[PDB]
Tab-separated table of C-alpha atoms and ligand atoms in Angstrom:
chain	number	residue	atom	x	y	z
A	1	UNK	CA	-25.969	-5.325	-11.322
A	2	UNK	CA	-24.477	-1.935	-12.231
A	3	UNK	CA	-21.057	-2.585	-13.850
A	4	UNK	CA	-18.477	0.226	-13.562
A	5	UNK	CA	-15.578	0.490	-16.073
A	6	UNK	CA	-12.635	2.859	-16.168
A	7	UNK	CA	-10.041	3.885	-18.794
A	8	UNK	CA	-7.136	4.010	-19.253
A	9	UNK	CA	-5.864	1.199	-17.006
A	10	UNK	CA	-2.756	3.383	-16.543
A	11	UNK	CA	-0.918	6.392	-17.941
A	12	UNK	CA	1.973	8.737	-17.061
A	13	UNK	CA	1.994	12.515	-17.356
A	14	UNK	CA	4.712	15.103	-16.666
A	15	UNK	CA	4.264	17.513	-13.767
A	16	UNK	CA	2.334	20.632	-14.906
A	17	UNK	CA	0.383	18.762	-17.640
A	18	UNK	CA	-3.316	17.866	-17.812
A	19	UNK	CA	-4.692	14.392	-17.015
A	20	UNK	CA	-8.027	13.067	-18.299
A	21	UNK	CA	-9.610	9.768	-17.186
A	22	UNK	CA	-12.888	8.121	-17.859
A	23	UNK	CA	-15.602	6.163	-16.019
A	24	UNK	CA	-18.549	4.358	-17.595
A	25	UNK	CA	-21.667	2.892	-15.901
A	26	UNK	CA	-23.781	0.160	-17.475
A	27	UNK	CA	-26.881	2.166	-16.330
A	28	UNK	CA	-27.583	5.876	-16.082
A	29	UNK	CA	-26.627	7.162	-12.619
A	30	UNK	CA	-28.922	10.165	-12.931
A	31	UNK	CA	-31.498	10.037	-10.100
A	32	UNK	CA	-34.799	11.397	-11.472
A	33	UNK	CA	-36.099	12.462	-8.051
A	34	UNK	CA	-32.969	14.367	-6.841
A	35	UNK	CA	-31.607	15.213	-10.351
A	36	UNK	CA	-28.047	14.280	-9.325
A	37	UNK	CA	-25.656	11.731	-10.745
A	38	UNK	CA	-24.662	9.310	-7.929
A	39	UNK	CA	-21.022	9.045	-9.019
A	40	UNK	CA	-18.007	9.637	-6.776
A	41	UNK	CA	-14.225	9.727	-7.432
A	42	UNK	CA	-11.647	8.433	-4.899
A	43	UNK	CA	-7.877	8.786	-4.870
A	44	UNK	CA	-5.722	6.048	-3.431
A	45	UNK	CA	-2.064	6.932	-2.972
A	46	UNK	CA	0.493	4.072	-2.538
A	47	UNK	CA	0.061	2.360	0.849
A	48	UNK	CA	-2.855	4.632	1.883
A	49	UNK	CA	-6.653	4.274	2.289
A	50	UNK	CA	-8.858	5.700	-0.496
A	51	UNK	CA	-9.705	9.425	-0.088
A	52	UNK	CA	-12.920	11.065	-1.354
A	53	UNK	CA	-12.237	13.650	-4.113
A	54	UNK	CA	-15.487	14.346	-5.974
A	55	UNK	CA	-19.135	13.335	-5.460
A	56	UNK	CA	-22.491	13.797	-7.216
A	57	UNK	CA	-20.266	13.673	-10.419
A	58	UNK	CA	-19.028	17.313	-10.075
A	59	UNK	CA	-18.935	18.435	-6.409
A	60	UNK	CA	-15.343	18.853	-5.138
A	61	UNK	CA	-14.935	17.760	-1.501
A	62	UNK	CA	-13.552	20.405	0.938
A	63	UNK	CA	-9.775	20.339	1.179
A	64	UNK	CA	-9.515	18.976	-2.369
A	65	UNK	CA	-7.255	21.095	-4.626
A	66	UNK	CA	-9.059	23.059	-7.373
A	67	UNK	CA	-6.937	21.209	-9.975
A	68	UNK	CA	-9.314	18.153	-9.639
A	69	UNK	CA	-12.603	18.474	-11.609
A	70	UNK	CA	-15.333	15.896	-12.094
A	71	UNK	CA	-17.750	16.154	-15.024
A	72	UNK	CA	-20.183	14.046	-17.059
A	73	UNK	CA	-23.694	12.639	-16.662
A	74	UNK	CA	-25.831	9.536	-17.063
A	75	UNK	CA	-23.457	6.742	-18.127
A	76	UNK	CA	-20.165	8.639	-18.779
A	77	UNK	CA	-17.979	10.528	-16.419
A	78	UNK	CA	-14.586	12.220	-16.417
A	79	UNK	CA	-12.024	13.222	-13.869
A	80	UNK	CA	-9.706	15.955	-15.075
A	81	UNK	CA	-6.518	16.992	-13.292
A	82	UNK	CA	-4.986	20.267	-14.453
A	83	UNK	CA	-1.406	21.249	-13.570
A	84	UNK	CA	-0.565	17.737	-12.265
A	85	UNK	CA	1.805	17.524	-9.275
A	86	UNK	CA	4.269	14.804	-8.286
A	87	UNK	CA	2.053	14.034	-5.266
A	88	UNK	CA	-0.896	13.177	-7.514
A	89	UNK	CA	0.599	9.656	-8.128
A	90	UNK	CA	-2.330	7.352	-7.211
A	91	UNK	CA	-4.950	4.899	-8.366
A	92	UNK	CA	-8.228	6.717	-9.047
A	93	UNK	CA	-11.547	4.894	-8.607
A	94	UNK	CA	-15.020	5.940	-9.556
A	95	UNK	CA	-17.948	4.527	-7.593
A	96	UNK	CA	-21.732	4.510	-8.234
A	97	UNK	CA	-24.167	4.759	-5.316
A	98	UNK	CA	-27.349	4.717	-7.397
A	99	UNK	CA	-28.133	1.009	-6.596
A	100	UNK	CA	-26.160	-0.050	-3.499
A	101	UNK	CA	-22.471	0.628	-4.458
A	102	UNK	CA	-20.009	-0.630	-7.048
A	103	UNK	CA	-16.431	0.490	-7.791
A	104	UNK	CA	-14.746	0.666	-11.200
A	105	UNK	CA	-11.403	-1.086	-11.673
A	106	UNK	CA	-9.255	2.024	-11.182
A	107	UNK	CA	-6.888	4.077	-13.278
A	108	UNK	CA	-3.246	4.133	-12.208
A	109	UNK	CA	-1.624	7.546	-12.619
A	110	UNK	CA	2.193	7.740	-12.752
A	111	UNK	CA	4.476	10.738	-13.218
A	112	UNK	CA	6.995	11.273	-16.005
A	113	UNK	CA	10.236	13.032	-15.108
A	114	UNK	CA	13.860	13.547	-16.326
A	115	UNK	CA	15.997	10.367	-16.442
A	116	UNK	CA	17.862	9.821	-13.176
A	117	UNK	CA	20.721	7.448	-12.417
A	118	UNK	CA	20.381	5.068	-9.452
A	119	UNK	CA	22.402	5.434	-6.280
A	120	UNK	CA	23.723	1.941	-5.587
A	121	UNK	CA	24.720	0.545	-2.167
A	122	UNK	CA	25.880	-2.982	-1.266
A	123	UNK	CA	25.741	-4.661	2.202
A	124	UNK	CA	27.541	-7.750	3.475
A	125	UNK	CA	25.726	-10.355	5.646
A	126	UNK	CA	25.455	-9.349	9.344
A	127	UNK	CA	27.263	-11.415	11.998
A	128	UNK	CA	23.816	-12.030	13.600
A	129	UNK	CA	22.607	-13.798	10.386
A	130	UNK	CA	25.857	-15.746	9.785
A	131	UNK	CA	25.712	-17.177	13.280
A	132	UNK	CA	22.457	-18.965	12.275
A	133	UNK	CA	23.980	-20.455	9.098
A	134	UNK	CA	22.654	-18.046	6.446
A	135	UNK	CA	24.172	-15.238	4.364
A	136	UNK	CA	22.140	-12.524	2.680
A	137	UNK	CA	23.845	-9.893	0.543
A	138	UNK	CA	21.721	-6.806	-0.216
A	139	UNK	CA	21.889	-4.111	-2.885
A	140	UNK	CA	19.737	-1.010	-2.925
A	141	UNK	CA	19.438	0.783	-6.243
A	142	UNK	CA	17.738	4.028	-5.213
A	143	UNK	CA	15.945	7.048	-6.733
A	144	UNK	CA	16.269	6.288	-10.445
A	145	UNK	CA	14.109	6.887	-13.513
A	146	UNK	CA	12.661	5.253	-15.676
A	147	UNK	CA	11.603	2.121	-13.770
A	148	UNK	CA	13.291	-0.382	-16.089
A	149	UNK	CA	16.558	-1.602	-14.689
A	150	UNK	CA	18.723	-4.696	-14.823
A	151	UNK	CA	20.704	-6.030	-11.862
A	152	UNK	CA	23.137	-8.893	-11.879
A	153	UNK	CA	25.090	-10.491	-9.104
A	154	UNK	CA	28.647	-11.565	-9.646
A	155	UNK	CA	30.580	-13.762	-7.243
A	156	UNK	CA	34.373	-13.813	-7.798
A	157	UNK	CA	33.806	-12.272	-11.237
A	158	UNK	CA	31.130	-14.802	-12.301
A	159	UNK	CA	27.421	-14.019	-12.798
A	160	UNK	CA	25.050	-15.774	-10.390
A	161	UNK	CA	18.633	-17.335	-4.632
A	162	UNK	CA	17.743	-13.711	-5.586
A	163	UNK	CA	14.792	-11.618	-4.226
A	164	UNK	CA	13.980	-8.463	-6.191
A	165	UNK	CA	11.494	-5.764	-5.087
A	166	UNK	CA	10.530	-2.366	-6.545
A	167	UNK	CA	8.862	0.450	-4.672
A	168	UNK	CA	5.880	2.349	-6.050
A	169	UNK	CA	6.959	5.651	-7.604
A	170	UNK	CA	8.032	8.257	-5.065
A	171	UNK	CA	5.410	11.002	-4.297
A	172	UNK	CA	8.062	13.696	-3.952
A	173	UNK	CA	10.739	13.169	-6.637
A	174	UNK	CA	8.859	10.772	-8.980
A	175	UNK	CA	11.731	8.208	-8.965
A	176	UNK	CA	11.762	4.435	-8.408
A	177	UNK	CA	13.853	2.290	-6.113
A	178	UNK	CA	14.697	-1.403	-6.119
A	179	UNK	CA	16.193	-3.812	-3.616
A	180	UNK	CA	17.964	-7.067	-4.623
A	181	UNK	CA	18.830	-9.715	-2.048
A	182	UNK	CA	21.076	-12.686	-2.763
A	183	UNK	CA	20.817	-15.452	-0.161
A	184	UNK	CA	23.510	-18.158	0.269
A	185	UNK	CA	24.368	-20.680	2.938
A	186	UNK	CA	27.128	-19.585	5.247
A	187	UNK	CA	29.352	-22.396	3.848
A	188	UNK	CA	28.840	-21.249	0.241
A	189	UNK	CA	29.336	-17.613	1.229
A	190	UNK	CA	32.679	-18.478	2.803
A	191	UNK	CA	33.971	-20.171	-0.412
A	192	UNK	CA	34.177	-16.931	-2.317
A	193	UNK	CA	35.620	-13.500	-1.844
A	194	UNK	CA	34.217	-10.895	-4.253
A	195	UNK	CA	30.495	-10.012	-4.148
A	196	UNK	CA	29.292	-7.556	-6.762
A	197	UNK	CA	25.932	-5.855	-7.480
A	198	UNK	CA	25.923	-4.542	-11.130
A	199	UNK	CA	23.150	-2.171	-12.227
A	200	UNK	CA	22.485	-1.414	-15.882
A	201	UNK	CA	20.087	1.466	-16.493
A	202	UNK	CA	19.585	3.671	-19.581
A	203	UNK	CA	21.274	6.665	-17.860
A	204	UNK	CA	24.750	5.262	-18.604
A	205	UNK	CA	26.356	2.846	-20.982
A	206	UNK	CA	28.682	2.264	-17.956
A	207	UNK	CA	27.017	-0.057	-15.399
A	208	UNK	CA	27.122	1.076	-11.778
A	209	UNK	CA	29.195	-1.504	-9.958
A	210	UNK	CA	29.217	-1.876	-6.167
A	211	UNK	CA	31.350	-4.558	-4.631
A	212	UNK	CA	32.836	-5.799	-1.380
A	213	UNK	CA	35.383	-8.521	-0.554
A	214	UNK	CA	34.712	-10.935	2.302
A	215	UNK	CA	38.413	-10.609	3.354
A	216	UNK	CA	38.057	-6.855	3.981
A	217	UNK	CA	35.032	-7.232	6.233
B	1	UNK	CA	-11.992	15.213	14.304
B	2	UNK	CA	-13.239	12.004	12.667
B	3	UNK	CA	-11.605	8.630	13.451
B	4	UNK	CA	-12.270	5.171	11.966
B	5	UNK	CA	-10.072	2.360	13.301
B	6	UNK	CA	-10.248	-1.255	12.042
B	7	UNK	CA	-9.073	-4.217	14.079
B	8	UNK	CA	-9.352	-8.000	13.878
B	9	UNK	CA	-7.432	-8.848	10.718
B	10	UNK	CA	-4.743	-11.493	10.660
B	11	UNK	CA	-4.229	-15.118	9.681
B	12	UNK	CA	-7.105	-17.597	9.436
B	13	UNK	CA	-7.424	-21.034	7.855
B	14	UNK	CA	-9.602	-21.914	4.825
B	15	UNK	CA	-13.186	-22.586	6.027
B	16	UNK	CA	-12.567	-20.511	9.141
B	17	UNK	CA	-14.396	-17.444	10.392
B	18	UNK	CA	-13.200	-14.039	11.443
B	19	UNK	CA	-14.882	-10.957	12.777
B	20	UNK	CA	-13.515	-7.470	12.131
B	21	UNK	CA	-14.297	-4.334	14.079
B	22	UNK	CA	-14.258	-0.643	13.196
B	23	UNK	CA	-14.267	1.782	16.128
B	24	UNK	CA	-15.406	5.302	15.261
B	25	UNK	CA	-15.461	8.802	16.788
B	26	UNK	CA	-16.001	12.503	16.097
B	27	UNK	CA	-19.388	12.297	14.330
B	28	UNK	CA	-22.926	11.188	15.274
B	29	UNK	CA	-22.682	7.429	14.611
B	30	UNK	CA	-26.401	6.713	14.429
B	31	UNK	CA	-26.966	9.375	11.724
B	32	UNK	CA	-24.724	7.457	9.319
B	33	UNK	CA	-24.826	4.394	7.130
B	34	UNK	CA	-21.555	2.471	7.335
B	35	UNK	CA	-19.969	0.372	4.587
B	36	UNK	CA	-17.288	-2.306	4.353
B	37	UNK	CA	-14.984	-2.429	1.339
B	38	UNK	CA	-12.092	-4.807	0.589
B	39	UNK	CA	-9.024	-4.817	-1.632
B	40	UNK	CA	-6.970	-7.890	-2.550
B	41	UNK	CA	-3.222	-6.948	-2.787
B	42	UNK	CA	-2.637	-5.037	-6.093
B	43	UNK	CA	-6.332	-5.269	-7.108
B	44	UNK	CA	-9.440	-3.035	-7.200
B	45	UNK	CA	-11.680	-1.880	-4.318
B	46	UNK	CA	-14.786	-4.109	-3.879
B	47	UNK	CA	-17.858	-2.916	-1.989
B	48	UNK	CA	-19.162	-5.653	0.396
B	49	UNK	CA	-22.222	-4.252	2.197
B	50	UNK	CA	-23.625	-1.574	4.404
B	51	UNK	CA	-25.792	-1.090	7.451
B	52	UNK	CA	-28.257	1.793	7.386
B	53	UNK	CA	-28.682	4.628	9.884
B	54	UNK	CA	-31.160	4.978	12.724
B	55	UNK	CA	-33.753	6.765	10.520
B	56	UNK	CA	-33.639	3.708	8.211
B	57	UNK	CA	-33.941	1.009	10.932
B	58	UNK	CA	-30.272	-0.110	10.842
B	59	UNK	CA	-31.100	-2.565	8.000
B	60	UNK	CA	-28.336	-4.337	5.998
B	61	UNK	CA	-27.534	-4.904	2.291
B	62	UNK	CA	-24.740	-7.017	0.726
B	63	UNK	CA	-22.923	-7.431	-2.540
B	64	UNK	CA	-24.118	-10.525	-4.367
B	65	UNK	CA	-20.490	-11.758	-3.963
B	66	UNK	CA	-20.742	-12.178	-0.165
B	67	UNK	CA	-24.500	-12.184	0.633
B	68	UNK	CA	-25.274	-15.170	2.886
B	69	UNK	CA	-21.683	-15.553	4.018
B	70	UNK	CA	-20.760	-12.171	5.574
B	71	UNK	CA	-22.861	-10.296	8.168
B	72	UNK	CA	-22.593	-6.641	9.169
B	73	UNK	CA	-23.727	-5.307	12.564
B	74	UNK	CA	-23.241	-2.213	14.684
B	75	UNK	CA	-23.157	-1.237	18.374
B	76	UNK	CA	-24.839	2.141	18.611
B	77	UNK	CA	-23.945	2.551	22.326
B	78	UNK	CA	-20.195	2.442	21.529
B	79	UNK	CA	-20.095	3.673	17.910
B	80	UNK	CA	-18.483	0.382	16.652
B	81	UNK	CA	-19.125	-1.388	13.294
B	82	UNK	CA	-18.617	-5.116	12.803
B	83	UNK	CA	-18.092	-7.539	9.883
B	84	UNK	CA	-18.550	-11.208	10.535
B	85	UNK	CA	-16.959	-13.384	7.849
B	86	UNK	CA	-17.679	-17.115	7.467
B	87	UNK	CA	-16.308	-19.995	5.333
B	88	UNK	CA	-13.251	-17.996	4.377
B	89	UNK	CA	-11.301	-18.850	1.221
B	90	UNK	CA	-7.990	-17.704	-0.298
B	91	UNK	CA	-10.008	-15.267	-2.478
B	92	UNK	CA	-11.056	-13.421	0.723
B	93	UNK	CA	-7.400	-12.480	1.472
B	94	UNK	CA	-7.519	-8.704	1.311
B	95	UNK	CA	-7.279	-5.412	3.113
B	96	UNK	CA	-10.679	-4.663	4.694
B	97	UNK	CA	-11.758	-1.014	5.144
B	98	UNK	CA	-14.746	0.553	6.923
B	99	UNK	CA	-16.032	3.841	5.445
B	100	UNK	CA	-18.630	6.293	6.659
B	101	UNK	CA	-21.464	6.157	4.099
B	102	UNK	CA	-24.892	7.862	3.478
B	103	UNK	CA	-26.524	10.249	5.969
B	104	UNK	CA	-29.817	10.311	4.029
B	105	UNK	CA	-28.674	13.281	1.918
B	106	UNK	CA	-25.051	13.141	0.670
B	107	UNK	CA	-23.903	10.471	-1.750
B	108	UNK	CA	-20.263	9.890	-0.787
B	109	UNK	CA	-17.986	7.847	1.470
B	110	UNK	CA	-16.553	10.736	3.488
B	111	UNK	CA	-14.054	8.876	5.683
B	112	UNK	CA	-12.193	5.550	5.615
B	113	UNK	CA	-10.277	3.545	8.213
B	114	UNK	CA	-6.604	2.595	7.842
B	115	UNK	CA	-7.569	-0.962	6.763
B	116	UNK	CA	-6.958	-4.340	8.379
B	117	UNK	CA	-5.206	-7.164	6.454
B	118	UNK	CA	-6.821	-10.635	6.390
B	119	UNK	CA	-4.790	-13.645	5.126
B	120	UNK	CA	-6.506	-16.958	4.499
B	121	UNK	CA	-3.851	-19.700	4.554
B	122	UNK	CA	-2.798	-23.003	6.177
B	123	UNK	CA	0.737	-21.708	6.812
B	124	UNK	CA	1.852	-21.136	10.454
B	125	UNK	CA	2.734	-17.692	11.832
B	126	UNK	CA	6.538	-17.132	11.648
B	127	UNK	CA	8.204	-14.084	13.224
B	128	UNK	CA	10.783	-12.215	11.145
B	129	UNK	CA	14.553	-12.193	11.608
B	130	UNK	CA	15.692	-8.598	11.543
B	131	UNK	CA	19.231	-7.879	10.330
B	132	UNK	CA	21.096	-4.565	10.172
B	133	UNK	CA	22.508	-3.270	6.914
B	134	UNK	CA	25.692	-1.291	7.618
B	135	UNK	CA	28.279	-0.351	4.950
B	136	UNK	CA	31.148	-2.875	4.830
B	137	UNK	CA	34.690	-2.301	6.186
B	138	UNK	CA	35.729	-0.942	2.755
B	139	UNK	CA	32.675	0.916	1.373
B	140	UNK	CA	30.781	10.790	0.229
B	141	UNK	CA	28.250	13.241	1.670
B	142	UNK	CA	25.246	10.924	2.137
B	143	UNK	CA	25.235	7.466	3.672
B	144	UNK	CA	22.711	4.699	3.143
B	145	UNK	CA	21.833	2.186	5.887
B	146	UNK	CA	19.104	-0.476	6.066
B	147	UNK	CA	17.308	-3.364	7.782
B	148	UNK	CA	16.559	-6.722	6.253
B	149	UNK	CA	13.327	-8.175	7.590
B	150	UNK	CA	13.505	-11.828	6.574
B	151	UNK	CA	11.387	-14.945	6.600
B	152	UNK	CA	8.080	-14.003	8.210
B	153	UNK	CA	4.403	-14.933	7.747
B	154	UNK	CA	1.675	-13.536	7.363
B	155	UNK	CA	1.922	-9.911	6.264
B	156	UNK	CA	2.108	-7.212	7.363
B	157	UNK	CA	5.185	-5.783	9.058
B	158	UNK	CA	5.784	-2.110	9.892
B	159	UNK	CA	9.215	-0.486	9.762
B	160	UNK	CA	10.127	2.929	11.088
B	161	UNK	CA	13.484	4.622	11.641
B	162	UNK	CA	14.342	6.349	14.971
B	163	UNK	CA	10.733	5.857	16.109
B	164	UNK	CA	9.514	7.765	13.014
B	165	UNK	CA	11.710	10.868	13.418
B	166	UNK	CA	13.599	9.718	10.306
B	167	UNK	CA	10.983	9.477	7.541
B	168	UNK	CA	12.441	11.555	4.733
B	169	UNK	CA	14.870	9.551	2.588
B	170	UNK	CA	13.344	6.159	3.582
B	171	UNK	CA	12.454	3.436	1.076
B	172	UNK	CA	10.534	0.528	2.504
B	173	UNK	CA	10.400	-2.191	-0.165
B	174	UNK	CA	7.252	-4.254	-0.699
B	175	UNK	CA	7.451	-7.762	0.712
B	176	UNK	CA	8.115	-10.675	-1.645
B	177	UNK	CA	6.875	-14.200	-0.948
B	178	UNK	CA	9.427	-17.012	-1.534
B	179	UNK	CA	8.860	-20.595	-0.467
B	180	UNK	CA	6.091	-19.760	2.028
B	181	UNK	CA	7.793	-16.784	3.760
B	182	UNK	CA	7.921	-13.034	3.191
B	183	UNK	CA	11.033	-10.860	3.177
B	184	UNK	CA	11.312	-7.155	2.926
B	185	UNK	CA	13.975	-4.512	3.363
B	186	UNK	CA	14.110	-0.879	4.230
B	187	UNK	CA	16.743	1.770	3.390
B	188	UNK	CA	17.393	5.122	5.003
B	189	UNK	CA	19.775	7.768	3.636
B	190	UNK	CA	21.290	10.276	6.067
B	191	UNK	CA	24.178	12.834	6.088
B	192	UNK	CA	27.494	10.977	6.706
B	193	UNK	CA	28.362	13.557	9.398
B	194	UNK	CA	25.411	12.199	11.407
B	195	UNK	CA	26.146	8.468	11.444
B	196	UNK	CA	27.746	6.788	13.376
B	197	UNK	CA	28.027	10.176	15.242
B	198	UNK	CA	24.258	9.979	15.973
B	199	UNK	CA	22.305	6.722	16.478
B	200	UNK	CA	20.243	5.148	13.650
B	201	UNK	CA	17.773	2.417	14.631
B	202	UNK	CA	15.072	0.605	12.623
B	203	UNK	CA	11.948	-0.321	14.569
B	204	UNK	CA	10.142	-3.351	13.193
B	205	UNK	CA	6.807	-4.755	14.238
B	206	UNK	CA	5.101	-8.053	13.151
B	207	UNK	CA	1.598	-7.951	14.702
B	208	UNK	CA	0.789	-11.552	13.937
B	209	UNK	CA	3.571	-12.793	16.233
B	210	UNK	CA	3.420	-9.604	18.424
B	211	UNK	CA	7.091	-9.139	17.477
B	212	UNK	CA	8.714	-5.795	18.413
B	213	UNK	CA	12.376	-5.276	17.414
B	214	UNK	CA	14.672	-2.220	17.547
B	215	UNK	CA	17.908	-2.841	15.653
B	216	UNK	CA	20.692	-0.302	16.038
B	217	UNK	CA	22.828	0.135	12.924
B	218	UNK	CA	26.420	-0.129	14.300
B	219	UNK	CA	29.498	0.821	12.203
B	220	UNK	CA	31.951	-1.938	11.247
B	221	UNK	CA	34.935	-0.243	13.015
B	222	UNK	CA	34.586	2.476	15.670
C	301	LIG	C1	-35.217	2.647	4.328
C	301	LIG	C2	-34.932	3.243	3.089
C	301	LIG	C3	-35.793	4.161	2.445
C	301	LIG	O1	-35.560	4.778	1.220
C	301	LIG	C4	-34.957	5.824	0.423
C	301	LIG	C5	-35.811	6.180	-0.836
C	301	LIG	O2	-36.027	7.401	-1.138
C	301	LIG	O3	-36.224	5.190	-1.500
C	301	LIG	C6	-33.532	5.492	-0.121
C	301	LIG	C7	-32.371	5.663	0.891
C	301	LIG	O4	-31.048	5.623	0.266
C	301	LIG	C8	-30.530	4.359	-0.278
C	301	LIG	C9	-30.899	3.053	0.462
C	301	LIG	O5	-31.332	2.065	-0.191
C	301	LIG	O6	-30.748	3.002	1.683
C	301	LIG	O7	-31.045	4.223	-1.741
C	301	LIG	C10	-30.709	5.477	-2.512
C	301	LIG	C11	-31.493	5.298	-3.847
C	301	LIG	O8	-31.045	6.376	-4.655
C	301	LIG	C12	-33.020	5.204	-3.647
C	301	LIG	O9	-33.340	6.593	-3.411
C	301	LIG	C13	-29.188	5.590	-2.636
C	301	LIG	O10	-28.670	4.411	-3.277
C	301	LIG	C14	-28.579	5.706	-1.213
C	301	LIG	O11	-27.177	5.764	-1.328
C	301	LIG	C15	-28.977	4.541	-0.255
C	301	LIG	O12	-28.512	3.269	-0.660
C	301	LIG	C16	-32.363	6.997	1.682
C	301	LIG	O13	-31.956	8.116	0.837
C	301	LIG	C17	-33.775	7.176	2.318
C	301	LIG	C18	-33.912	8.513	3.097
C	301	LIG	O14	-33.016	8.547	4.231
C	301	LIG	C19	-35.364	8.835	3.560
C	301	LIG	O15	-35.519	8.719	4.998
C	301	LIG	O16	-34.859	6.969	1.320
C	302	MG	MG1	28.947	-21.930	-6.797
C	303	ZN	ZN1	-33.288	-4.273	1.741
């Protein structure tokens, strides 16, 4: 086979800086007849299909910003991004087409930005859910940076059936968001009053506390 | 303009078969090789095979990984590409893409479809419960609302807000699997002068169960 390998697995760069990533083939990709390297670069943004960026190692596809440059030959190739933009968040794949086709494993590119505190919102169970015997309490912790965050649930002042989910980094502001869902039975829900989402993030030594009381609903 | 549209993905049991389609338009179909590529959730792209153009006798080639088990064909009268998959296993669960390939000159995959998600599993299809997330009767310039999309199988689900007219300030959280069912949520943040003044509705679809739901976010009082 031809084996394709990329490095790094992942990195993060601040907007305006240069990015360099690497792609190795187990065999030269230099076609002797055409004198081109059959190596392409693809960009895959979160939730999207892959998009062609570069082909024949160095040819930039139309529509592709000039900040993206492919170089290299034979077994070693480079994609360079100058003046990186928030929207450049993506996994980048190289692909050989010298002998059928094979993809490398990708390089994830993330964006570094200023620390940003989360915006925290809490939501009681809906009457439509409670009618069926269940009670989900939801907390969104939105548009923060860096990604590391700690959430705890407290019920009547005591720490406590939790689903956590993080978004991919945002293409526009380079922040992260997380959702935490605590699910109880209706009967257990109705035994307590105070429901609290507590978020601890590096941006404050004070946790962000959002709470509601079942009695006030 | 060029269009590639996959269909046929969904839920299938281990050992089962499935055939995907990829309808195309806006280029001369017969001039082009066509490839299939897949991607398991959170993993790398994997090339599966191609079918050559008219000049090359529409012949097929396959990755060693799926040769003998998958078959590619094309309908040149309708510009549609097919992928027949047999003896499916959990490892075949993936997003499947078609891509326009070689034209005899350029080495590149110029265009890709949106992808179709295949899930290989014994689990039954379960439609989601969709619940509104409205600030409580005690909860400021901006306001955050949401929908909880709970307890469905297989992926995927789509969520939009006001039929896609609200797209800025949306966070749709990746689904998490917990005892055999997925749950996801979506938030939208709007000016507080605009809700409940103006309507906010999440539109949720679950193709596997043909579920279509619009859920209006109603204020607690009001
Ligand atoms: C029926 C095929 C013929 O052959 C080729 C040739 O010059 O050998 C190759 C064709 O391209 C492929 C292919 O096998 O279909 O192989 C090339 C490889 O470099 C050999 O040249 C690339 O891997 C390419 O992407 C294809 O995978 C094709 O270029 C063909 C041409 O259309 C002549 O009519 O000639
Ligand atoms: Mg208890
Ligand atoms: Zn052959």
